[PDB]
Design an enzyme around this catalytic site. Structure first.
Site, PDB file in Angstrom:
ATOM      1  N   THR A  96       7.887  40.672  52.759  1.00  0.00           N
ATOM      2  CA  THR A  96       8.293  39.274  52.442  1.00  0.00           C
ATOM      3  C   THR A  96       7.314  38.725  51.394  1.00  0.00           C
ATOM      4  N   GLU A  99      61.476  32.064  60.003  1.00  0.00           N
ATOM      5  CA  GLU A  99      60.775  31.306  61.072  1.00  0.00           C
ATOM      6  C   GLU A  99      60.059  30.100  60.450  1.00  0.00           C
ATOM      7  N   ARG A 133      -3.994  49.176  55.500  1.00  0.00           N
ATOM      8  CA  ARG A 133      -2.618  49.239  54.968  1.00  0.00           C
ATOM      9  C   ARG A 133      -2.701  49.675  53.507  1.00  0.00           C
ATOM     10  N   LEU A 148      54.039  55.679  48.757  1.00  0.00           N
ATOM     11  CA  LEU A 148      54.823  55.214  47.582  1.00  0.00           C
ATOM     12  C   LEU A 148      55.642  56.415  47.096  1.00  0.00           C
ATOM     13  N   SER A 196      10.724  56.193  34.690  1.00  0.00           N
ATOM     14  CA  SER A 196       9.330  55.885  34.267  1.00  0.00           C
ATOM     15  C   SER A 196       8.316  56.754  35.010  1.00  0.00           C
ATOM     16  N   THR A 203      47.176  39.077  59.800  1.00  0.00           N
ATOM     17  CA  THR A 203      46.599  40.169  58.967  1.00  0.00           C
ATOM     18  C   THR A 203      46.632  39.805  57.472  1.00  0.00           C
ATOM     19  N   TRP A 248       0.047  31.954  50.807  1.00  0.00           N
ATOM     20  CA  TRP A 248      -0.163  33.027  49.797  1.00  0.00           C
ATOM     21  C   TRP A 248      -0.364  32.439  48.393  1.00  0.00           C
ATOM     22  N   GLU A 283      16.161  36.557  58.454  1.00  0.00           N
ATOM     23  CA  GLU A 283      15.154  36.701  59.542  1.00  0.00           C
ATOM     24  C   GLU A 283      14.385  35.391  59.759  1.00  0.00           C
ATOM     25  N   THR A 301      55.476  58.646  43.412  1.00  0.00           N
ATOM     26  CA  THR A 301      54.306  58.227  42.595  1.00  0.00           C
ATOM     27  C   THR A 301      52.986  58.341  43.371  1.00  0.00           C
ATOM     28  N   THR A 311       3.817  44.477  57.354  1.00  0.00           N
ATOM     29  CA  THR A 311       3.080  45.241  56.312  1.00  0.00           C
ATOM     30  C   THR A 311       2.873  44.389  55.062  1.00  0.00           C
TER      31      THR A 311
HETATM   32  N1  LIG Z   1      54.205  62.577  41.412  1.00  0.00           N
HETATM   33  C1  LIG Z   1      53.402  62.442  42.470  1.00  0.00           C
HETATM   34  N2  LIG Z   1      52.072  62.674  42.318  1.00  0.00           N
HETATM   35  C2  LIG Z   1      51.263  62.518  43.381  1.00  0.00           C
HETATM   36  N3  LIG Z   1      51.577  62.169  44.629  1.00  0.00           N
HETATM   37  C3  LIG Z   1      52.905  61.974  44.749  1.00  0.00           C
HETATM   38  C4  LIG Z   1      53.855  62.088  43.758  1.00  0.00           C
HETATM   39  N4  LIG Z   1      55.124  61.828  44.269  1.00  0.00           N
HETATM   40  C5  LIG Z   1      54.926  61.587  45.548  1.00  0.00           C
HETATM   41  N5  LIG Z   1      53.584  61.610  45.881  1.00  0.00           N
HETATM   42  C6  LIG Z   1      52.989  61.389  47.194  1.00  0.00           C
HETATM   43  O1  LIG Z   1      53.900  61.938  48.106  1.00  0.00           O
HETATM   44  C7  LIG Z   1      54.351  60.947  49.064  1.00  0.00           C
HETATM   45  C8  LIG Z   1      55.830  61.106  49.259  1.00  0.00           C
HETATM   46  O2  LIG Z   1      56.037  62.137  50.234  1.00  0.00           O
HETATM   47  P1  LIG Z   1      57.512  62.351  50.808  1.00  0.00           P
HETATM   48  O3  LIG Z   1      58.473  61.530  49.991  1.00  0.00           O
HETATM   49  O4  LIG Z   1      57.743  63.798  51.056  1.00  0.00           O
HETATM   50  O5  LIG Z   1      57.329  61.646  52.266  1.00  0.00           O
HETATM   51  P2  LIG Z   1      58.098  61.881  53.654  1.00  0.00           P
HETATM   52  O6  LIG Z   1      57.333  62.722  54.621  1.00  0.00           O
HETATM   53  O7  LIG Z   1      59.443  62.369  53.239  1.00  0.00           O
HETATM   54  O8  LIG Z   1      58.159  60.401  54.233  1.00  0.00           O
HETATM   55  P3  LIG Z   1      59.432  59.624  54.793  1.00  0.00           P
HETATM   56  O9  LIG Z   1      59.743  60.455  56.004  1.00  0.00           O
HETATM   57  O10 LIG Z   1      59.021  58.176  55.059  1.00  0.00           O
HETATM   58  O11 LIG Z   1      60.543  59.692  53.770  1.00  0.00           O
HETATM   59  C9  LIG Z   1      53.902  59.593  48.531  1.00  0.00           C
HETATM   60  O12 LIG Z   1      53.537  58.818  49.662  1.00  0.00           O
HETATM   61  C10 LIG Z   1      52.710  59.946  47.640  1.00  0.00           C
HETATM   62  O13 LIG Z   1      51.564  59.809  48.454  1.00  0.00           O
HETATM   63  N1  LIG Z   2      42.493  28.688  52.393  1.00  0.00           N
HETATM   64  C1  LIG Z   2      42.098  29.716  53.135  1.00  0.00           C
HETATM   65  N2  LIG Z   2      40.821  30.161  53.049  1.00  0.00           N
HETATM   66  C2  LIG Z   2      40.457  31.208  53.802  1.00  0.00           C
HETATM   67  N3  LIG Z   2      41.187  31.919  54.661  1.00  0.00           N
HETATM   68  C3  LIG Z   2      42.449  31.449  54.706  1.00  0.00           C
HETATM   69  C4  LIG Z   2      42.969  30.398  53.995  1.00  0.00           C
HETATM   70  N4  LIG Z   2      44.311  30.210  54.292  1.00  0.00           N
HETATM   71  C5  LIG Z   2      44.587  31.150  55.155  1.00  0.00           C
HETATM   72  N5  LIG Z   2      43.487  31.918  55.461  1.00  0.00           N
HETATM   73  C6  LIG Z   2      43.440  33.050  56.362  1.00  0.00           C
HETATM   74  O1  LIG Z   2      44.684  33.701  56.264  1.00  0.00           O
HETATM   75  C7  LIG Z   2      45.278  33.819  57.571  1.00  0.00           C
HETATM   76  C8  LIG Z   2      46.754  33.611  57.464  1.00  0.00           C
HETATM   77  O2  LIG Z   2      47.325  34.839  57.063  1.00  0.00           O
HETATM   78  P1  LIG Z   2      48.913  34.943  57.030  1.00  0.00           P
HETATM   79  O3  LIG Z   2      49.543  33.604  57.278  1.00  0.00           O
HETATM   80  O4  LIG Z   2      49.337  35.745  55.850  1.00  0.00           O
HETATM   81  O5  LIG Z   2      49.166  35.805  58.356  1.00  0.00           O
HETATM   82  P2  LIG Z   2      50.369  36.745  58.809  1.00  0.00           P
HETATM   83  O6  LIG Z   2      49.968  38.182  58.620  1.00  0.00           O
HETATM   84  O7  LIG Z   2      51.567  36.270  58.034  1.00  0.00           O
HETATM   85  O8  LIG Z   2      50.453  36.405  60.361  1.00  0.00           O
HETATM   86  P3  LIG Z   2      51.779  36.246  61.273  1.00  0.00           P
HETATM   87  O9  LIG Z   2      52.423  37.607  61.474  1.00  0.00           O
HETATM   88  O10 LIG Z   2      51.225  35.671  62.567  1.00  0.00           O
HETATM   89  O11 LIG Z   2      52.678  35.287  60.525  1.00  0.00           O
HETATM   90  C9  LIG Z   2      44.585  32.782  58.443  1.00  0.00           C
HETATM   91  O12 LIG Z   2      44.683  33.339  59.743  1.00  0.00           O
HETATM   92  C10 LIG Z   2      43.192  32.660  57.819  1.00  0.00           C
HETATM   93  O13 LIG Z   2      42.212  33.462  58.437  1.00  0.00           O
HETATM   94  N1  LIG Z   3      -3.447  33.663  54.728  1.00  0.00           N
HETATM   95  C1  LIG Z   3      -3.392  34.959  55.000  1.00  0.00           C
HETATM   96  N2  LIG Z   3      -4.517  35.694  54.863  1.00  0.00           N
HETATM   97  C2  LIG Z   3      -4.444  37.014  55.085  1.00  0.00           C
HETATM   98  N3  LIG Z   3      -3.400  37.741  55.482  1.00  0.00           N
HETATM   99  C3  LIG Z   3      -2.301  36.980  55.608  1.00  0.00           C
HETATM  100  C4  LIG Z   3      -2.216  35.624  55.396  1.00  0.00           C
HETATM  101  N4  LIG Z   3      -0.920  35.185  55.621  1.00  0.00           N
HETATM  102  C5  LIG Z   3      -0.258  36.269  55.964  1.00  0.00           C
HETATM  103  N5  LIG Z   3      -1.046  37.396  55.979  1.00  0.00           N
HETATM  104  C6  LIG Z   3      -0.666  38.799  56.315  1.00  0.00           C
HETATM  105  O1  LIG Z   3       0.686  39.036  55.975  1.00  0.00           O
HETATM  106  C7  LIG Z   3       1.394  39.596  57.107  1.00  0.00           C
HETATM  107  C8  LIG Z   3       2.839  39.180  57.014  1.00  0.00           C
HETATM  108  O2  LIG Z   3       3.383  39.708  55.790  1.00  0.00           O
HETATM  109  P1  LIG Z   3       4.975  39.705  55.535  1.00  0.00           P
HETATM  110  O3  LIG Z   3       5.628  38.502  56.128  1.00  0.00           O
HETATM  111  O4  LIG Z   3       5.277  39.905  54.085  1.00  0.00           O
HETATM  112  O5  LIG Z   3       5.331  40.998  56.420  1.00  0.00           O
HETATM  113  P2  LIG Z   3       6.715  41.804  56.597  1.00  0.00           P
HETATM  114  O6  LIG Z   3       6.469  43.208  56.228  1.00  0.00           O
HETATM  115  O7  LIG Z   3       7.732  41.001  55.869  1.00  0.00           O
HETATM  116  O8  LIG Z   3       6.929  41.722  58.178  1.00  0.00           O
HETATM  117  P3  LIG Z   3       8.257  41.405  59.026  1.00  0.00           P
HETATM  118  O9  LIG Z   3       9.467  41.471  58.119  1.00  0.00           O
HETATM  119  O10 LIG Z   3       8.252  42.481  60.046  1.00  0.00           O
HETATM  120  O11 LIG Z   3       8.105  40.033  59.641  1.00  0.00           O
HETATM  121  C9  LIG Z   3       0.612  39.070  58.316  1.00  0.00           C
HETATM  122  O12 LIG Z   3       0.811  39.870  59.474  1.00  0.00           O
HETATM  123  C10 LIG Z   3      -0.829  39.144  57.799  1.00  0.00           C
HETATM  124  O13 LIG Z   3      -1.390  40.434  57.902  1.00  0.00           O
HETATM  125  N1  LIG Z   4       9.235  59.241  31.746  1.00  0.00           N
HETATM  126  C1  LIG Z   4       8.745  59.759  32.871  1.00  0.00           C
HETATM  127  N2  LIG Z   4       7.473  60.216  32.866  1.00  0.00           N
HETATM  128  C2  LIG Z   4       6.967  60.714  34.002  1.00  0.00           C
HETATM  129  N3  LIG Z   4       7.549  60.866  35.190  1.00  0.00           N
HETATM  130  C3  LIG Z   4       8.810  60.416  35.160  1.00  0.00           C
HETATM  131  C4  LIG Z   4       9.466  59.865  34.078  1.00  0.00           C
HETATM  132  N4  LIG Z   4      10.759  59.516  34.433  1.00  0.00           N
HETATM  133  C5  LIG Z   4      10.860  59.855  35.702  1.00  0.00           C
HETATM  134  N5  LIG Z   4       9.698  60.412  36.200  1.00  0.00           N
HETATM  135  C6  LIG Z   4       9.474  60.985  37.556  1.00  0.00           C
HETATM  136  O1  LIG Z   4      10.706  61.571  37.932  1.00  0.00           O
HETATM  137  C7  LIG Z   4      11.196  60.974  39.166  1.00  0.00           C
HETATM  138  C8  LIG Z   4      12.704  60.887  39.156  1.00  0.00           C
HETATM  139  O2  LIG Z   4      13.248  62.240  39.176  1.00  0.00           O
HETATM  140  P1  LIG Z   4      14.761  62.485  39.606  1.00  0.00           P
HETATM  141  O3  LIG Z   4      15.590  61.317  39.206  1.00  0.00           O
HETATM  142  O4  LIG Z   4      15.214  63.839  39.198  1.00  0.00           O
HETATM  143  O5  LIG Z   4      14.614  62.452  41.212  1.00  0.00           O
HETATM  144  P2  LIG Z   4      15.699  62.860  42.325  1.00  0.00           P
HETATM  145  O6  LIG Z   4      15.121  63.873  43.259  1.00  0.00           O
HETATM  146  O7  LIG Z   4      16.988  63.188  41.635  1.00  0.00           O
HETATM  147  O8  LIG Z   4      15.756  61.440  43.031  1.00  0.00           O
HETATM  148  P3  LIG Z   4      16.876  60.752  43.936  1.00  0.00           P
HETATM  149  O9  LIG Z   4      16.466  61.054  45.338  1.00  0.00           O
HETATM  150  O10 LIG Z   4      16.768  59.290  43.584  1.00  0.00           O
HETATM  151  O11 LIG Z   4      18.195  61.368  43.537  1.00  0.00           O
HETATM  152  C9  LIG Z   4      10.458  59.636  39.270  1.00  0.00           C
HETATM  153  O12 LIG Z   4      10.428  59.170  40.615  1.00  0.00           O
HETATM  154  C10 LIG Z   4       9.094  60.021  38.684  1.00  0.00           C
HETATM  155  O13 LIG Z   4       8.335  60.644  39.690  1.00  0.00           O
HETATM  156 MG   LIG Z   5       9.364  39.984  56.384  1.00  0.00          MG
END
Ligand SMILES: Nc1ncnc2c1ncn2[C@@H]1O[C@H](COP(=O)(O)OP(=O)(O)OP(=O)(O)O)[C@@H](O)[C@H]1O
Ligand SMILES: Nc1ncnc2c1ncn2[C@@H]1O[C@H](COP(=O)(O)OP(=O)(O)OP(=O)(O)O)[C@@H](O)[C@H]1O
Ligand SMILES: Nc1ncnc2c1ncn2[C@@H]1O[C@H](COP(=O)(O)OP(=O)(O)OP(=O)(O)O)[C@@H](O)[C@H]1O
Ligand SMILES: Nc1ncnc2c1ncn2[C@@H]1O[C@H](COP(=O)(O)OP(=O)(O)OP(=O)(O)O)[C@@H](O)[C@H]1O
Ligand SMILES: [Mg+2]
Ligand SMILES: Nc1ncnc2c1ncn2[C@@H]1O[C@H](COP(=O)(O)OP(=O)(O)OP(=O)(O)O)[C@@H](O)[C@H]1O
Ligand SMILES: Nc1ncnc2c1ncn2[C@@H]1O[C@H](COP(=O)(O)OP(=O)(O)OP(=O)(O)O)[C@@H](O)[C@H]1O
Ligand SMILES: Nc1ncnc2c1ncn2[C@@H]1O[C@H](COP(=O)(O)OP(=O)(O)OP(=O)(O)O)[C@@H](O)[C@H]1O
Ligand SMILES: [Mg+2]
Ligand SMILES: [Mg+2]
Ligand SMILES: [Mg+2]
Ligand SMILES: [Mg+2]
Ligand SMILES: [Mg+2]
EC number: 2.7.11.1
Lengths: 456, 458, 452
Positions: free
Chosen positions: A254, A61, A410, A195, A420, A34, A290, A277, A198, A251
């Protein structure tokens, strides 16, 4: 309040709101592999290298030599720290062929190396009697004013915290490491259970093992590489935006990603494509048909294409690989083809976490992000995405088929453009050897958005 | 930092990123019949034959002679290796042991050891812990790489037997044999490799040439014919040689006819064509095909056509995939057809089905074999979906066949829905089935709602 | 008849209908870190500080120095109470223990006793003997016990709960990957209590439909919308603005916040989809300066990710931000971001909780909802919270002559006349400009109308 010392484990000091409670024991519990030894080593290593705080690692160990050899893969040079008197590994493993005496050795080592951090791995291996034993050890380390990690084993991911269902009640602090099989994929999570005295964040946070345990906006415009689409978006896409191209298979998504990438490259900026893909060969052949030359862009070091299978890795691993390549290549444009490939056969919660991660990261680095979604319904679909990620995106390009006079036409629509004006038209488009040609709305039709319109 | 030695077990050196950590114990755990003894034998056999590393195999139950006899079914000749002093099998069976193992490692200069199985000795969890530690420590001291096999009663319960073995070992591998409905699916997982990298979670495998664990493809503009003139014109000059073709539509639309043409046209160019049929027998396929003048029986006996008929329910998907891979390897087709992907999808998980489709399609493209797959839809009209299994994005060309109610009759129409890398006809073209095969005519230009199946004349 | 003594733990005295039965033992059972020690300490602390009732804390594991240091995180100064001889911490870190407990109770004239924890067949007689001695001495006792499971055995040995007159279970439940804290009063022999689990948070210790309703109006910040709602929103109302992605929900939020601040009133925004930067930029397109309104101390924006905390903890944050900042107006953008991947029952309790707090404070609430279906939706919300809200604004896309137009309906308006029109609006540089209903079309609400 209760004072904490920084672990400097990436993300851990955030979820703990400052680090581990100073002068206290923290239980780190988990099933095999872990990351327990990892956390326990990182703790001491960061203590010495960042804070000049000496460390004792007690093993029951694994051999010192194996602890040192394992840490090398991370570029951690433990031997150097031993030669400087900063790190001491106390070998308490059994004979290849009690308790009071062990507590006395640890105290000698603490006072001799002036150590403030102690890791013990694992107290499970040296075992109601268990309860009093963890208590005695914890008591003496508190008295000596060191901060301790004690690692424990467990058998079940969601059962007892430790092994003898007692350890956690003695410890002031409990961290649980999980490695949960989600279908055929494993997901690493850390939880701060407790903790005393805290605050901490609650429940499970994702993490990866790489380099140790790893837990702004602007009005600037940027081209799509399609002249008419730039007009329809109000002068182009925003530089600091997430763009979603969504619609049925075939559509033109890409094609729109190809144009996005190529356009950044001809401005001499780097572009990075994650393809889930299609192979590099096929991407390039299709792109050439293209009028786009991915091969020339690749030679000039401006375009990098990363090809991978979704079901080869877990979502957290895909995100780590994405973050690494961005940090390395340093793109201004990033593309994902497709988000819908990565959503197949995963929980929507895991997928939504992945999407929030990739997009958060892109917007922090001020990278322009272009993502594709293929809809399951090829016609009459009443939704942008089946995964409900719409609210995470800034711009939405709706691509859809429309039956006109017995043929499959399309149309493209700028559905959303945060920040905008955009054209409201459902504009017919044609794909050719020159890519996307966008024409006019269907003026004299009703029910266009259904896919089967009726002439007025 | 941690170096690995190659296992050369097919696919294992990929998931381990180079094989097993040198000088350490790897635990291989599983239920009965998971492949543990197979894995242990293969580690030593590959060590001897490929890298001249000698090996010790320790058995605690199975006779040497039964281990030797069992390996001969894979064509591995263990006796010759024992004659040459490259392999030594130590019978530790019923009618200390560390002493004997160390004597054999010195005598045969062995760098690889397999212990099968360490469970059969083991009582207290503390007893097994200290015992597995001592054995592992003594073997590491000698500088040899070890596999220790262990038993379990459950597929998703404890790693091993006493919930302690996995914590002692530096390296843990789990072989699983999961019941999924009434079908078994073999998987392998590297849970932990201390101090190094590995792929995570479960990987499918089969046992054929020992253990067999199983996006960098070529892409040309080369065209091939469908065997239907008008369809070739609709696809912009032909199917692409490097493509996956999906023909989807309701029951009876003409998908199997389109497969018959696809395969017949290959044989007509003196190429081998390979058909996997999951719904109809050879005799029924042959009778229906002769309706268009296609003689499957002559094409079979002249060695141009091979038809494999099987029921989906007779094997798990991973074993269907193995049969497709080895039939492609033996027969070396230019064209491969599956009729149907819908047949394979029923009563298996979507996840496992998509894995199967990535695998068959990915291997066809790898070998530059043109693939043609059929899919029958559950809705015979008004379907808003290409497939219910959502495999569209894995295919390059999609042919959509649909029924269309015209003047109180059921007509049919064909559409080239998608064609990656080419222009295609956008028309929804009426077609009719006769002795000439598929006769494709004009789109219905006078109707609205054709794609709904119940058009309206304007 | 059984009498209760008040605990004064926020919400405990309501669910217990007065407090803990006097003269008896309450068992407090939980897994690790459920609040057991916190409860046992608060009981004694609240007894001494509010009712001047001396207390004894008996500890079997934790040191007195740890108990005192831990309580300092809430500003409970246990040392000053020990120095006044109102608190005694008995360090037991069985006949002999009962002796010291008796002596302590007598020496300190204590009416309250916490024992933490009694886990640290034979247990049954042990707990019984202990509970009996404290009953004869007339003290009310908390006994904390440890569980291994959330829905398994009440305590550890399957007897503790049958011996105690009163049983309380503290739970820390994993719902997906988020933790939910609940308190349940399982049994109080000889009296009444509320049944099942009640949400709580740890903030200032353990923190576990009768509001006013006036005819006062407030502006939406859009003239035409104020007329459509019959002279403005009601001050005492919950406004739900609902519709497809991009219809203009956030724009309506920005208007509602701005018009408040421009009258010298404080507004508070909880944003769960967008950063402060993106919010400010988009808002400055309509001539709104969030940074300036913040600078003047009239606006406060809280940006968080839904997935970052549980809903009980989001609701705590909202309640403490309102208590601190004292707004006239509050916005949630968006409720749909909060609903994602939680249970509908959890989501609804969150919504009833936040709307109840706005309504009892006389704060105008404006919540957004994005619908999953961008056209032809037969529902206001997929989460079915319509009946918790007073005013509903439906924003929807309408296909007109090959273009995507927009329309607004005041769908519901409890307490007032409202326009019945499904009125086209356009979003320009001036904000939302609302125009007329499409009076020559049929099926506008479907999103694909027909010209009549
Ligand atoms: N000043 C603080 N502000 C916010 N959260 C706090 C603060 N002091 C403690 N905590 C939260 O309260 C928890 C401590 O709860 P408490 O000491 O009652 O646990 P417990 O049920 O007695 O657990 P254990 O049985 O292992 O002793 C911490 O894990 C932290 O999440
Ligand atoms: N250089 C590295 N790059 C990427 N992943 C690494 C690298 N070295 C270790 N790891 C990852 O960290 C893991 C080792 O984690 P660690 O030795 O802390 O395990 P552990 O929790 O102490 O396990 P155990 O209770 O069996 O001792 C490996 O299983 C590997 O996936
Ligand atoms: N030389 C070409 N002349 C005209 N249309 C073309 C040509 N080459 C590709 N296309 C059009 O582009 C389409 C593929 O577009 P694109 O790969 O961007 O699609 P997409 O939305 O990414 O699809 P998907 O991710 O599902 O594969 C074709 O099915 C065709 O309609
Ligand atoms: N300067 C501008 N002039 C004209 N139309 C604008 C301008 N700025 C933003 N818009 C319009 O306002 C829209 C954004 O409105 P708004 O951010 O309130 O949408 P929303 O419902 O909160 O969207 P979302 O689902 O992303 O939270 C744009 O998509 C466009 O239609
Ligand atoms: Mg595509
Ligand atoms: N020649 C072969 N061809 C195909 N499959 C084979 C062949 N030989 C063995 N197998 C398969 O391998 C299985 C045996 O594998 P193995 O002997 O490694 O099992 P195991 O895990 O060691 O079992 P146990 O723990 O009971 O000893 C057989 O049950 C069979 O399914
Ligand atoms: N001799 C023939 N003359 C005319 N039409 C024929 C003839 N033989 C078959 N057909 C037509 O072809 C259809 C069968 O074609 P085919 O087997 O390819 O359909 P399918 O879509 O594969 O069917 P299924 O869903 O059952 O697998 C018949 O239903 C009929 O309409
Ligand atoms: N003074 C008024 N003049 C005109 N219409 C009014 C007036 N007061 C209320 N209404 C109308 O009555 C509606 C509310 O009626 P009522 O509360 O009985 O609806 P309901 O179906 O019970 O709603 P809910 O689903 O919220 O329970 C308002 O939306 C509005 O149409
Ligand atoms: Mg370890
Ligand atoms: Mg075997
Ligand atoms: Mg057929
Ligand atoms: Mg406690
Ligand atoms: Mg919004």
């Amino acid at each position: 309040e209760v004072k904490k010392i920084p672990t400097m484990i990436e993300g851990f000091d955030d979820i703990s709101h400052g680090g581990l409670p100073q002068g206290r024991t923290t239980l780190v519990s988990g099933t095999s592999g872990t990351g327990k030894t990892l956390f326990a080593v990182q703790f001491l290593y960061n203590g010495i290298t960042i804070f000049n705080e000496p460390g004792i690692f007690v093993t029951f160990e694994e051999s010192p030599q194996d602890i040192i050899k394992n840490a090398l893969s991370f570029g951690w040079n433990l031997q150097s720290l031993i030669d400087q008197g900063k790190l001491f590994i106390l070998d308490a493993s059994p004979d290849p062929d009690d308790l009071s005496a062990l507590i006395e050795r640890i105290q000698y080592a603490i006072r001799k190396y002036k150590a403030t951090r102690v890791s013990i791995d694992s107290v499970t291996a040296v075992f109601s009697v268990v309860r009093r034993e963890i208590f005695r050890l914890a008591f003496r380390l508190k008295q000596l004013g060191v901060t301790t990690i004690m690692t424990t084993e467990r058998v079940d991911e969601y059962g007892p915290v430790a092994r003898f269902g007692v350890e956690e009640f003695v410890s002031d602090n409990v961290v649980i490491l999980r490695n949960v099989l989600e279908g055929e994929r494993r997901r690493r999570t850390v939880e701060i259970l407790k903790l005393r005295g805290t605050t901490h964040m609650k429940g499970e946070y994702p993490f990866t093992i790489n380099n140790g345990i790893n837990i702004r906006s602007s009005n600037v415009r940027v081209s799509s590489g399609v002249k008419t689409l730039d007009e329809m978006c109000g002068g182009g896409f925003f530089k600091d935006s997430i763009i979603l191209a969504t619609g049925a298979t075939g559509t033109g998504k890409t094609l729109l990603v190809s144009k996005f990438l190529e356009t950044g490259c001809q401005q001499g900026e780097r572009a990075l494509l994650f393809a889930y893909e299609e192979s590099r060969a096929q991407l390039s052949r299709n792109a050439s048909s293209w009028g786009i030359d991915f091969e020339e862009l690749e030679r000039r070091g401006l375009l990098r294409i990363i090809c991978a299978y979704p079901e080869s890795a877990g979502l957290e691993d895909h995100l780590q690989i994405i973050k690494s390549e961005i940090a390395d290549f340093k793109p201004s444009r990033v593309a994902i083809d497709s988000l819908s490939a990565l959503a197949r056969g995963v929980s929507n919660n895991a997928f939504r976490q992945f999407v929030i991660g990739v997009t958060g990261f892109a917007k922090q680095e001020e990278i322009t992000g272009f993502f594709t979604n293929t809809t399951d319904q090829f016609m009459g679909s009443n939704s942008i995405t089946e995964s409900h990620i719409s609210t995470i995106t800034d711009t939405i390009l709706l691509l859809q088929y429309v039956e006109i006079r017995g043929e499959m036409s399309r149309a493209i629509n700028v559905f959303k453009m945060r920040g905008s004006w955009h054209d409201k038209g459902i504009r017919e488009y044609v794909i050719t050897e020159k890519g996307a040609e966008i024409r006019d709305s269907f003026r004299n039709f009703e029910g266009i958005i259904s896919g089967t319109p009726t002439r007025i």
